Write a protein of this length. Structure first.
Ligand SMILES: [Mg+2]
Ligand SMILES: [Mg+2]
Ligand SMILES: [Mg+2]
Ligand SMILES: [Mg+2]
Ligand SMILES: [Mg+2]
Ligand SMILES: [Mg+2]
Ligand SMILES: [Mg+2]
Ligand SMILES: [Mg+2]
Ligand SMILES: [Mg+2]
Ligand SMILES: [Mg+2]
Ligand SMILES: [Mg+2]
Ligand SMILES: [Mg+2]
Ligand SMILES: [Mg+2]
Ligand SMILES: [Mg+2]
Ligand SMILES: [Mg+2]
Ligand SMILES: [Mg+2]
Ligand SMILES: [Mg+2]
Lengths: 58, 203, 86, 233, 125, 45, 34, 154
RNA sequence: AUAAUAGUAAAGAUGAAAUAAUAAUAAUAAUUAUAAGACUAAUAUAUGUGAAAAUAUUAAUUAAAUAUUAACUGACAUUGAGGGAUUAAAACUAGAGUAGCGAAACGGAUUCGAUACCCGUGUAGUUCUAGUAGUAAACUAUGAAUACAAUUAUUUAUAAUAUAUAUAUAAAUAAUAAAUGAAAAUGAAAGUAUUCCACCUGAAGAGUACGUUAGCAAUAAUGAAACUCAAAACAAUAGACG
């Protein structure tokens, strides 16, 4: 029974750890992500006004 | 036990492979273990394989993949050209040395890459070869120009003082017919296991 | 409910985790708040699929009915799990 | 193919004939076949050991026999799916014979491609007669090859001079190399000697090769000219 | 829910082609953010010629400016974004398509994944 | 929990290994014999 | 049923259909009001 | 159970047909008893407990940890190009289970068709369950046990 | 289909021909430009997926779906009369829609005749929305479930191996052994066994009549008897024939 309880709990813990890691990764990323208007405008300027790194293949 | 004997025995000794017997790509070294018979054993069609081999084969050497297949025939090819290339190379007597400044691998988890040469030459570079006429400085070998030159079972890069027009331009793409002499300078060996010879055309 | 999250997350726990990360970074504001908001939006129920919501409901039902924490096949809990799907 | 009753029950069928009087005289084979009976028991017999390895076929590792935690730290408390399936076909299908030496052989010829070009006679001489002490590589009846190396490696492993397999293999390889170099030097010097003392070789190997190429080229040329003519027309 | 977008915008002005595209990107991004959404990346693509002379209502187009917007939203929000795209006269072809987050959370655009970079972390680094 | 699981098993294995030791351990405490040993181990941990 | 055997059945079915077509007005008369 | 018994009989027949030597059976009490009865009459060469993978060399006690993977290995028997255990037809089928008194069993033994059973044959063995113990029908008669006529091997 | 452009006498059709909303009112072909419906080239193997009908242009939404592990439940299962739901094509009732195709009808051929096969106009119909109805060679002409039995080759997925090798599993597909079978052949079932349901008992008459129920209807289900024969049917064989 004890062994079975451990097995049940260990997997859950691992899953929790994975979820936390994923969250951490998302947080690390999220400086690039946009919510506000000003950030969106800045992103647009970076993309369009620079005239650099247009994804076109050759 | 029987199992131990089987593991020891001469068919177990031939390391298995399912590489093509017909490979039209670039051949830099032997693909398959060459297998010879004696003349007596050939006469009664026995090669030391699972089955008898067809009486049509009169060559003593061959190469194989499968002892027996679903088609009820051993997958073989009656040819052992690779031994003759090695023997030609030995005759030429140009010792293979690594052009890169490195120690000779034969002196002192697993690495599948080719340890120095593949074993076509265990010759050492420091020797001279005397004869009645004297000590041979320049190794004279006959070869054929293709367009590169075929020199004793190896293709080799070639150089000369002046490009001779009389021999070349008379027969532009039948240069393979006429055998020319060559002075082999040195033989280097690359990572892929290709022997990169370098010759010089003599006239 | 308003600050409920998908993907087996909990909003209180997420905030605490973010705070811990911040503390670790300091050891080794507006922007940080914006990032946190973005994360919440990503992990919110209302932006996620219905499937996640159903899964959450099933989990809740299981928690309610389980005659002990380990059991998930309890005839009653099975029935409860069926009900949410139904 | 059904199990034939009538190939092995020959003496019984003849004994009946003899009893009847259909046969007046007994065959020559009759007494002999009576003395030495056929098998007549055409069974599928199960096998419990792989002979090459010495692995056990029949047994099943239990839950109680695996007390400690698994990879990914989970304790086995139940039989898995495969532990419930009735593995009878494994007892009957003949075992795939595996050897440690096969891997070494494969490695050697990868490392030494041109060792494949050394021709190999597979027609065995008396396997019982041989008696090789693998203290050294050079055995008498056997030639020098990758096999001899591998045998040396195995001997080293057995004796525990080199506890590790890889080190033993390397050592065997290094023993081989020196011998090969010596062999190479022997032939060259013998050739030199022959040249010095007025020996005459009519056809050298390279000359032979050139001659062989020449015939093929001649065959090609006539054909190629015909093909060019065809193309023109 | 991470939805990728591909809009092929109009380019009326010869000298300054990207302006209409930029405006479109602004507007749709604004919509997304007003509506609980989170635009992750706005990958530009080149002024690429169309395969055929593609035509909107009472117009014709042979060249267009292409871009990907890789945003999060609800399903209803996305559907409505799609509708607005369909409605507007300054886009030729529009296409929203889902990016599945059952396994991962960080997922780059389709182009970036094809190149090699699975997550946006890889792109950043 | 994992450490607890380990300790019970390792002790039991040790008990199984040594027969003379096992009887002495049982006396100190106070198939059937094996079960009793296991129970004692559980009580200890 | 082989095809040959089926053909008798088919023929029967056709005849029945024909009979029904013939006796449409009669059937109608019989059906209504009784 | 009786369905199980029928399945094992069918399996035995199949194995006799193709000439396998050593055959697995499910590990139950009734099944074990049946196998033991066959062994004693002389239809099986061997009978031994074991895993799902093979027969066991040493003793292994059967518990909830093992029970699902446990199995009853059984050696089959052949002589002069003919299998010993030719047939394994059962009599009491799951749907029409038949229970004879001692008199009926005696009659069966002495060549009388009863309840549509062909009476038992020269080299045959009718097994009989009586208070959860499988016996020969002759043995049951001797002991005087009114029992379920289980099955029939030849 | 309509319109414009320029352009010239045939065009379209067929076995060969004609009739026609064809063409000297300027067509057909060509190039443009509008509109309208309905269909979905390759990939494709219906591989696969679906209970079966079905199901291959793209996207989104919601639903359902595989395997292996971990834990839990503790025989809760199988089959299933009656019953229930879904059920191609045609058909029907409404309201839209109607390009192409196309029962019928009319016309031209063909033919001794031609209520046909071919050609031309082409209405119902085919399309959508809401329903009715519950049948098809609705077929694998093979009800569902479980246990079991000898090989090989193909793929597919799973695990280990020291990511690309040779291995162990399953799953399907294709050849078979045995076994079964009237044979054709079936081949993990048409084999060995167990369980449950449906159904058959000579051919005609007949899935007809009468009756009942259901339907807007066409019809669907249910389903007799008299009368009359020693017939009637299947697998395979050898011919003759095309
Ligand atoms: Mg029939
Ligand atoms: Mg079905
Ligand atoms: Mg298609
Ligand atoms: Mg059912
Ligand atoms: Mg269809
Ligand atoms: Mg219809
Ligand atoms: Mg209508
Ligand atoms: Mg018509
Ligand atoms: Mg309906
Ligand atoms: Mg009908
Ligand atoms: Mg029907
Ligand atoms: Mg169909
Ligand atoms: Mg057969
Ligand atoms: Mg049968
Ligand atoms: Mg077949
Ligand atoms: Mg009636
Ligand atoms: Mg009817």
């Amino acid at each position: 029974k004890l062994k079975r309880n451990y097995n049940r709990s260990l997997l859950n813990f691992q899953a929790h750890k994975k979820k936390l890691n994923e969250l951490l990764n998302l947080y690390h990323v999220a400086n690039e992500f946009i919510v506000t208007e000003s950030q969106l405008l800045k992103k647009i300027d970076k993309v369009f006004n620079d005239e650099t790194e247009e994804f076109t293949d050759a | 036990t029987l199992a131990e004997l089987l593991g020891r025995s001469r068919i177990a000794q031939v390391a298995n492979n399912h590489k093509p017997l017909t490979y039209t790509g670039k051949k830099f070294h032997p693909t398959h273990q060459i297998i010879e018979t004696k003349p007596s054993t050939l006469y009664r069609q026995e090669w030391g394989l699972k089955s008898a081999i067809p009486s049509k084969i009169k060559s003593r050497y061959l190469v194989y993949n499968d002892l027996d297949t679903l088609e009820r025939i051993t997958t073989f090819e009656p040819r052992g050209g690779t031994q003759w290339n090695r023997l030609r190379f030995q005759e030429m007597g140009v010792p293979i040395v690594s052009n890169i400044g490195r120690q000779n691998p034969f002196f002192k988890k697993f690495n599948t890459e080719i340890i120095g040469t593949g074993g076509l030459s265990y010759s050492l570079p420091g020797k001279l070869k005397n004869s009645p006429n004297g000590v041979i400085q320049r190794t004279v070998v006959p070869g054929r120009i293709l367009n590169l030159a075929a020199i004793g079972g190896f293709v080799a890069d070639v150089v000369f003082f002046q490009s001779p027009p009389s021999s070349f331009n008379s027969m532009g793409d039948f240069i393979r017919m006429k055998t020319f002499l060559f002075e082999i300078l040195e033989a280097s060996m690359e990572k892929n296991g290709s022997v990169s010879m370098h010759a010089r055309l003599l006239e | 409910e308003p600050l409920v999250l998908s993907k087996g997350y909990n909003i209180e726990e997420v905030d605490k985790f973010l705070a811990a990360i911040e503390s670790a970074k300091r050891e080794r504001i507006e922007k940080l708040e914006d990032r946190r908001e973005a994360i919440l939006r990503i992990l919110s129920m209302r932006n996620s699929e219905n499937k996640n919501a159903i899964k959450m409901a099933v989990e809740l039902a299981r928690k309610e009915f389980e005659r002990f924490p380990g059991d998930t096949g309890s005839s009653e809990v099975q029935a409860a799990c069926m009900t949410v799907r139904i | 193919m059904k199990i034939q009753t009538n190939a092995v029950n020959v003496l019984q069928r003849t004994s009946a004939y003899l009893k009847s009087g259909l046969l007046k005289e007994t065959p020559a084979w009759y007494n002999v076949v009576a003395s030495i009976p056929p098998s007549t028991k055409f069974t599928r017999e199960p096998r419990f050991k792989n002979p090459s390895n010495g692995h056990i076929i029949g047994k099943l590792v239990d839950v109680t026999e695996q007390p400690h935690a698994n990879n990914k730290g989970l304790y086995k408390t139940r039989p898995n799916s495969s532990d419930k399936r009735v593995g009878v076909k494994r007892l009957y299908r003949p075992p795939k014979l595996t050897y440690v030496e096969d891997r070494l052989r494969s490695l050697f010829y990868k490392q030494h491609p041109w060792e494949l070009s050394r021709p190999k006679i597979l027609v065995e001489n008396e396997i019982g007669d041989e008696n090789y002490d693998w203290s050294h590589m050079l055995q008498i009846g056997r030639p020098l090859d990758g096999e001899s190396v591998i045998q040396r490696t195995m001997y080293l492993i057995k004796t525990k001079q080199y506890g590790d397999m890889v080190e033993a293999y390397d050592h065997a390889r290094y023993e081989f190399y020196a011998l090969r170099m010596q062999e190479e030097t022997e032939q060259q010097v013998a050739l030199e000697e022959a040249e010095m003392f007025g020996s005459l070789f009519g056809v050298s190997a390279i000359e032979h090769g050139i001659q062989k190429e020449q015939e093929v080229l001649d065959v090609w040329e006539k054909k190629v000219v015909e093909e060019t003519e065809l193309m023109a027309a | 829910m991470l939805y990728e977008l591909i809009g092929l915008v109009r380019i009326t002005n010869s000298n300054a082609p990207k302006l209409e595209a930029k405006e479109l990107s602004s507007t749709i991004g604004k919509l997304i953010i007003q509506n609980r959404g989170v635009v992750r990346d706005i990958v530009p693509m080149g002024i690429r010629y169309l395969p055929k002379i593609m035509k909107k209502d009472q117009e014709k187009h042979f060249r267009a400016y292409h871009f990907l917007m890789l945003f999060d939203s609800s399903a209803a929000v996305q559907s409505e974004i799609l509708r607005t795209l369909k409605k507007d006269p300054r886009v030729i072809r529009s296409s929203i398509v889902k990016v599945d987050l059952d396994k991962q959370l960080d997922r780059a655009s389709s182009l970036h994944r094809s190149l090699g970079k699975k997550s946006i972390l890889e792109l950043v680094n | 929990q994992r450490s607890l699981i380990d300790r019970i098993q390792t002790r039991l294995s040790e008990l199984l290994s040594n027969d003379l030791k096992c009887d002495q351990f049982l006396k100190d405490h106070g198939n059937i014999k094996k079960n009793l040993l296991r129970k004692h181990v559980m009580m200890d941990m | 049923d082989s095809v040959m055997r089926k053909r008798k059945k088919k023929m029967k079915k056709h005849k029945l259909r024909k009979r029904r077509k013939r006796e449409k007005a009669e059937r109608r008369k019989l059906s209504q009001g009784r | 159970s009786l369905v199980k018994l029928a399945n094992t009989c069918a399996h035995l027949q199949n194995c006799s047909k193709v000439r396998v030597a050593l055959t697995s059976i499910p590990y139950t009490k009734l099944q074990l008893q049946f196998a033991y009865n066959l062994y004693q009459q002389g239809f099986l060469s061997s009978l031994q407990k074991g895993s799902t993978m093979g027969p066991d060399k040493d003793f292994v006690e059967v518990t909830p940890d093992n029970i699902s993977t446990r199995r009853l290995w059984v050696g089959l028997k052949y002589r002069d190009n003919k299998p010993v255990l030719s047939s394994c037809k059962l009599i009491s089928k799951p749907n029409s289970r038949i229970h004879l008194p001692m008199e009926d069993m005696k009659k069966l033994c002495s060549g009388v068709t009863i309840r549509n059973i062909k009476p038992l044959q020269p080299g045959e063995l009718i097994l009989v369950r009586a208070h959860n113990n499988i016996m020969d029908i002759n043995e049951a008669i001797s002991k005087k046990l009114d029992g379920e006529v289980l099955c029939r091997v030849k």
